[PDB]
Design an enzyme around this catalytic site. Structure first.
Site, short mmCIF file in Angstrom:
data_model
loop_
_atom_site.label_atom_id
_atom_site.label_comp_id
_atom_site.label_asym_id
_atom_site.label_seq_id
_atom_site.Cartn_x
_atom_site.Cartn_y
_atom_site.Cartn_z
N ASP A 101 40.43 29.83 35.60
CA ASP A 101 39.28 29.91 34.68
C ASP A 101 39.33 31.16 33.78
OD1 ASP A 101 36.65 28.69 33.77
OD2 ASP A 101 35.93 30.64 34.53
N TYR A 232 32.09 34.99 28.01
CA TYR A 232 31.92 33.90 27.04
C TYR A 232 31.32 34.38 25.71
CZ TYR A 232 32.27 30.82 31.20
OH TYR A 232 32.68 30.21 32.36
N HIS A 297 37.73 21.13 39.83
CA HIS A 297 37.92 22.42 39.14
C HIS A 297 38.44 23.55 40.04
CE1 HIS A 297 36.80 25.59 36.13
NE2 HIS A 297 36.39 26.27 37.20
#
Length: 318
Positions: A101, A232, A297
């Protein structure tokens, strides 16, 4: 676990919790969102059992690592700055890199800036973010998926944190960790709601214990989600700042592994990029792409033994 060594080190002006075990060539593990050093527990044990030095820090803003208050302290350059300092401390010229990630985006940056420091790279779930000079990272996501796409919803300071606070930390972590829904995560408007998972199970899947969830929860209840969310919030800024490497290629050897049901793999046109030729065009020494059947994931936790073996077999060629 009780043999894993935990220390606090000073790197790039912050205090970073480092977990490590074993001796041998360093294998550096980089977690993502909403993870911790702890996410790597199975890889740390396995790799340290096979003559490798396993190192897994909590990244800036996470866990027991310092969390700067300014949104601006979470550009990819800040994170790579932390890691170069850590690697210099470990005392090695090169490392093996394993990441997942956000850890993997940071890992790609490390390979972009300092390929000489990375022998080979086991990349989980997130392939290289191709820099399109014609459109910013998040602009492209918003055009493709709208304003309720999770990464867009993470952009406005304080908002997602407030929405997460309403449902509670434990719910957010269970919601995300248990999800097996493929495709772009799109949130309901105005709230967290069912977030990443409209089909939450009563019992945790068999790869995650009650204690595992409690560890995540205990850390996040302390730190909150702001530092992690701040990564982010620097995606468009990373896109501007990475312009010097526009149209560049990454020459580090890479093994890319993903679960079939991973939401990244099944969104953002990633399947085309991965298998269609682009990924290889950007990453000339991309070797094997492995897609793990019926895994989602969190593949290094869900399929831990498989992952351990892929990492080992790969890095041993070197």
């Amino acid at each position: 676990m009780e043999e894993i060594e935990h220390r606090t080190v000073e790197v790039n002006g912050i205090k970073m919790h480092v977990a490590e075990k074993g001796e041998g060539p360093v294998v550096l593990f980089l977690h993502g969102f909403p993870e911790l050093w702890y996410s790597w527990r199975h890889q740390i044990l396995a790799l340290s059992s096979r003559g490798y030095r396993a190192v897994a820090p909590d990244l800036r803003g996470y866990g027991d690592t310092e969390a700067p208050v300014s949104i601006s302290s979470y550009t990819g350059f800040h994170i790579v700055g932390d890691l170069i300092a850590l690697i210099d401390l470990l005392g090695v010229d090169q490392v093996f890199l394993v990441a997942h990630d956000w850890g993997a985006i940071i890992g790609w940056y490390l390979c972009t800036f300092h390929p000489d420091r990375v022998k080979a790279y086991v990349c989980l779930s997130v392939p290289l973010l191709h820099r399109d000079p014609n459109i910013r990272t998040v602009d492209a996501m918003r055009a493709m998926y709208g304003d309720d796409y999770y990464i867009c919803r993470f952009q406005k300071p304080g908002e997602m944190e407030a929405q997460m606070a309403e449902v509670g930390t434990e719910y957010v972590l269970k919601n995300i960790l248990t999800t097996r829904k493929p495709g772009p995560p799109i949130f309901p408007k105005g709230e967290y709601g069912t977030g990443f998972n409209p089909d939450m199970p009563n019992s945790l899947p068999s790869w995650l214990t009650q204690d595992d969830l409690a560890y995540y929860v205990s850390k996040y209840e302390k730190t909150g989600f702001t530092g992690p969310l701040n990564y982010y919030r620097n995606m468009n800024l990373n896109w501007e700042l990475t312009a010097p490497w526009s149209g560049g290629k990454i020459q580090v050897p890479v093994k890319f592994i993903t679960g079939e049901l991973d939401w990244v793999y099944t969104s953002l046109n990633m399947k085309e990029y991965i298998h269609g030729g682009g990924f290889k065009q950007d990453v000339p020494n991309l070797e094997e792409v492995i897609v793990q059947k019926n895994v989602a994931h969190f593949n290094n936790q869900e399929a831990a033994e498989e992952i351990n073996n892929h990492i080992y077999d790969f890095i041993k060629k070197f």
